From a paper:
The motility of the human pathogen *C. jejuni* is driven by a complex flagellar motor in each cell pole. The *C. jejuni* motor contains three disks: a basal disk composed of FlgP just below the outer membrane, a medial disk composed of PflC and PflD, and a proximal disk containing PflA and PflB. The distal spokes and rim are composed of PflA (spokes) and PflB (rim). Around the stator complexes, one L-shaped PflA binds one PflB via its flexible loop, locking 17 PflB monomers into a continuous rim that holds 17 MotB dimers ([Fig fig4]).
PflB is mainly composed of tetratricopeptide (TPR) repeats and can be divided into two parts by a β1-sheet (aa 386-390) ([Fig fig2]). Notably, the last 5 C-terminal residues form a β2-sheet (aa 813-817) that makes an antiparallel β-pair with the β1-sheet ([Fig fig2]). This antiparallel β-pair resembles a “hook and loop”, as the two β-sheets are separated by 423 residues in sequence yet engaged together in the 3D structure ([Fig fig2]). PflA consists of the N-terminal β-sandwich domain, flexible loop, and C-terminal 17 repetitive TPR repeats. The N-terminal β-sandwich domain and flexible loop region (16- 163 aa) are resolved in our cryo-EM structure ([Fig fig2]). The β-sandwich domain of PflA is made of four pairs of antiparallel β-sheets and here named PflA_AMIN_ for its resemblance to the AMIN1 and AMIN2 domains of PilQ in T4P ([Fig figs5]). Interestingly, the long loop of PflA (126-163 aa) wraps around the N-terminal extended TPR repeats of PflB, mainly via hydrophobic contacts ([Fig fig2] and [Fig figs5]). Deletion of the β2-sheet from PflB results in complete loss of motility ([Fig figs5]), supporting a structural role for the β-pair in PflB ([Fig fig2]).
Numbering used by the authors:
A (entry chain A): 15 to 163
B (entry chain B): 178 to 451, 462 to 820
Write the structure that this text describes.
């Protein structure tokens, strides 16, 4: 199984915080079909050969799998507002942070949180911000217990 | 002194293998398992080995609960989530770290994460809340992304001093200066950085740009604000409206009246300019001009002038046809010729100054000439021209006496009175002047639009749109032939339909009319092209404009400019360059064509010619038609 989902849930203020990470060895696609006031997050995966994959129901989103001939369609129905991100680039090595709004990569992150904000329109230049100071972070000097001197 | 301490103490000396071995020894001994695992993973990542990095990062988690009581627990968890690609978790967990030397690092990493996920404001706030790392370049880039160029310039200028961030900050500041409109500042900055010429071209090669149409053209709110409140409060609009209603000069009005079918002949023809064949030719071409056929009349006047090259009236008529056609330089030429061949034609001189003001040129000599000729005359029965002479200067008090005169009513007089009343905040008599104007001209598009905008001005957007829809629903227009006069009538009709959100239905109506039969006139095609440009349908507009140029005669400055606009909309930078060069060949000092040409040359990567066009622009100029965006792919 070269394709992996991980789910992490948590609390912020008094809300819900769901994060779904999808990864594969090859590049696959995910899109944000809107329909009518009901976002359906649809992912296309080559999948190689897979067995019967049962569908689970979760607090913030529902999952569905469709298995065609050597093709997998992942359907995500969010019960709350959801957003998509392409966290394929390794930030912890790189200094030129690219854009996270891409429709094809080897790692995708879906975020579910009730108290979100609508995307605003800013008249600006789509620069790639350069962070030149902290590239490979590490922990400094410590004692026999994990605590700074 | 400890194994972990010894490893980390070697590790900041840029010695990675020995430190990694020390970390392995510390992990084997069993001292500070989690932090040793994280540092060993980062050391392994210093060299080129991804598998070992992944193995050690995965191993780091299983010892984490052992160090459950540690004031740096938040930082360790955030780092572990940071190297695994789980970024939102790391961002959510990084805000709880309040230790002394790591709070700034936590805030910097949070800024990185926010910047990745397109939350620029939070990233700016996090970077500003930091006082350990110099984040001038990142702050400037983020400010540019948000759209606050005023602080972006300061941040980038601060970052320019450091040697490492020289080239990138220079390129970013150059692009920001282009975006804001300060061109001479950009050129001065470029000239003081390098001494060679190739090096200065490489700064413009850092970021690839892409030309785009301005988003402010399609905003309904701004169009309504500028249309229903400041219709006559603009020099270009004032001059265009004066040109529309201006009269056409003849020798004898009585002879010309028998050759024109308008029912308002006495209002659009004047004989104040101090052969029978010349009279009849003038009358025929004027009839062609007034009955919604402008291009053919302009061509006929141009052809007939070559036969008789000394007649003050003919130059005025050709110049008027050019001026109503948004061809201002030839209008200047022929207006000046007309005034120089007869210095008692004051309307010709006034229109010459108007045209010379619309393009960029000095006209003080002409103003003094007409002023001297005014002060030395036996009679001055024409005071309208004297009042009009003040319009070039940005003063309006001087025409206040004109509103108290015993006057014959012609549409030029009414529109001039409306301009004068509106420009002195006398917003009450504007309505009565416009009402009289509409009463004078029943079957006119522009009069109807003006009356509607005067009557329904004091409303909101929704009421304006609903009234407009109701008003034009019951209004029937012969679309085939009525949009064939001066360009301002179409432009204003398209703008009003854009405000009311009705231009899609009108677009469908005009298409159906076009598809009913075959070859037709120019007016419908130009109106449909303009509607397509204003409906964000660029491919059809570009095809229509190419058909206009290559099928009928469309070698005009305005038509070529609009074709270039459509081509830029349809992602054709190469054709836009040729079209804009051909447009500029006549109107040399066109401030909007030059900026677009410079941007297009920068996009095609021709920096030798990009600076040439930028060198001919002022330090304060915001193009209302073109902008650029950074191409990241």
């Amino acid at each position: 199984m070269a394709f992996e989902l991980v789910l992490n849930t948590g609390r912020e203020n008094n809300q819900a915080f769901a994060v779904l990470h999808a990864s594969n060895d090859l590049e696959f696609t995910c899109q944000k079909f809107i329909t009518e006031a009901k976002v359906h997050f649809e992912c296309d995966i080559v999948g190689m050969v897979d067995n019967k994959l049962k569908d689970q129901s979760f607090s913030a989103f529902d999952l569905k799998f469709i298995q065609e001939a050597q093709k997998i369609k992942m359907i995500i129905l969010p019960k709350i507002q959801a957003r998509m991100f392409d966290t394929s680039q390794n930030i912890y090595i790189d200094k030129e942070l690219s854009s996270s709004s891409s429709h094809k990569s080897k790692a995708f992150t879906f975020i579910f949180t009730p108290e979100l904000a609508p995307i605003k329109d800013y008249d600006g230049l789509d620069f790639n911000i350069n962070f030149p100071h902290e590239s490979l972070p590490y922990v400094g000097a410590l004692d026999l217990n994990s605590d700074p001197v | 002194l400890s194994n972990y301490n010894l490893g980390v103490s070697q590790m900041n000396e840029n010695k990675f293998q020995e430190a990694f071995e020390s970390f392995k020894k510390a992990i084997a001994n069993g001292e500070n398992q989690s932090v040793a695992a994280i540092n060993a993973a980062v050391c392994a990542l210093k060299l080129n080995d991804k598998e070992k990095f992944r193995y050690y990062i995965d191993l780091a988690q299983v010892y984490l609960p052992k160090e459950g009581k540690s004031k740096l627990y938040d930082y360790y968890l955030s780092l572990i989530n940071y190297y695994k690609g789980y970024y939102p978790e790391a961002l959510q967990m990084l805000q709880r770290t309040d230790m002394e030397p790591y709070s700034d690092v936590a805030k910097y990493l949070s800024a990185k994460i926010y910047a990745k996920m397109d939350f620029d404001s939070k990233a700016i706030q996090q970077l500003n809340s930091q006082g350990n790392f110099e984040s001038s370049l990142s702050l400037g880039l983020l400010y540019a992304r948000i759209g606050e160029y005023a602080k972006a310039k300061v941040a980038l200028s601060t970052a320019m001093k450091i040697e490492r961030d020289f080239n990138q900050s220079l390129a970013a500041l150059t692009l920001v200066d282009i975006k804001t409109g300060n061109y001479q500042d950009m050129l001065a900055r470029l000239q003081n950085s390098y001494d060679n010429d190739k090096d200065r071209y490489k700064i413009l090669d850092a970021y690839k740009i892409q030309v785009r149409l301005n988003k402010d053209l399609f905003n309904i709110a701004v169009a309504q604000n500028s249309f229903s409140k400041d219709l006559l409060k603009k020099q270009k609009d004032q001059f265009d409206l004066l040109f529309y209603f201006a009269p056409y000069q003849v020798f004898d009005s009585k002879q010309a009246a028998l050759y024109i079918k308008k029912a308002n002949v006495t209002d659009f023809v004047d004989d104040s300019a101090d052969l029978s064949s010349t009279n009849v030719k003038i009358a025929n071409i004027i009839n062609y001009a007034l009955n919604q056929k402008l291009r053919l009349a302009n061509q006929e006047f141009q052809k007939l002038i070559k036969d008789y090259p000394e007649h003050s009236i003919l130059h005025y008529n050709l110049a008027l046809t050019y001026a109503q056609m948004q061809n201002y330089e030839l209008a200047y030429k022929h207006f000046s010729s007309s005034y120089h061949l007869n210095p008692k034609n004051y309307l010709a001189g006034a229109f010459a100054m108007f045209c010379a003001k619309l393009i960029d040129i000095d006209t003080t000599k002409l103003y003094n000439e007409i002023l001297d000729n005014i002060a030395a005359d036996s009679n001055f029965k024409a005071n309208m021209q004297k009042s009009m002479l003040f319009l070039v200067n940005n003063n309006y008090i001087s025409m206040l006496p004109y509103l108290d005169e015993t006057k014959k009513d012609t549409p030029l007089s009414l529109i001039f009175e409306a301009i004068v009343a509106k420009n002195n905040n006398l917003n009450n008599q504007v309505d009565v002047k416009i009402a009289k104007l509409r009463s004078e001209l029943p079957e006119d598009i522009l009069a109807n639009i003006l009356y509607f905008n005067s009557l329904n001005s004091n409303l909101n957007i929704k009421e304006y749109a609903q009234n407009a829809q109701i008003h034009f629903k019951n209004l029937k227009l012969d679309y085939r032939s009525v949009f064939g006069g001066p360009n301002i009538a179409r432009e204003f009709y398209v703008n009003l339909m854009h405000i009311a959100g009705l231009l899609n239905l009108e677009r469908q109506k005009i298409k159906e009319l076009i598809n009913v039969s075959g070859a037709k006139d120019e007016g419908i095609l130009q109106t449909l092209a303009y509607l397509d440009i204003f409906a964000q349908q660029y491919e059809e507009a570009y095809a229509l404009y190419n058909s206009l140029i290559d099928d009928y005669g469309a070698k005009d400055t305005k038509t070529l400019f609009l074709a270039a606009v459509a081509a830029i909309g349809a992602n054709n930078p190469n054709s836009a360059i040729a079209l804009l060069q051909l447009s500029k060949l006549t109107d040399k000092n066109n401030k909007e064509s030059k900026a677009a040409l410079g941007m297009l040359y920068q996009e095609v990567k021709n920096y030798e010619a990009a600076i040439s066009q930028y060198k001919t622009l002022p330090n304060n100029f915001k193009s209302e038609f073109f902008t650029f965006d950074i191409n990241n792919n």
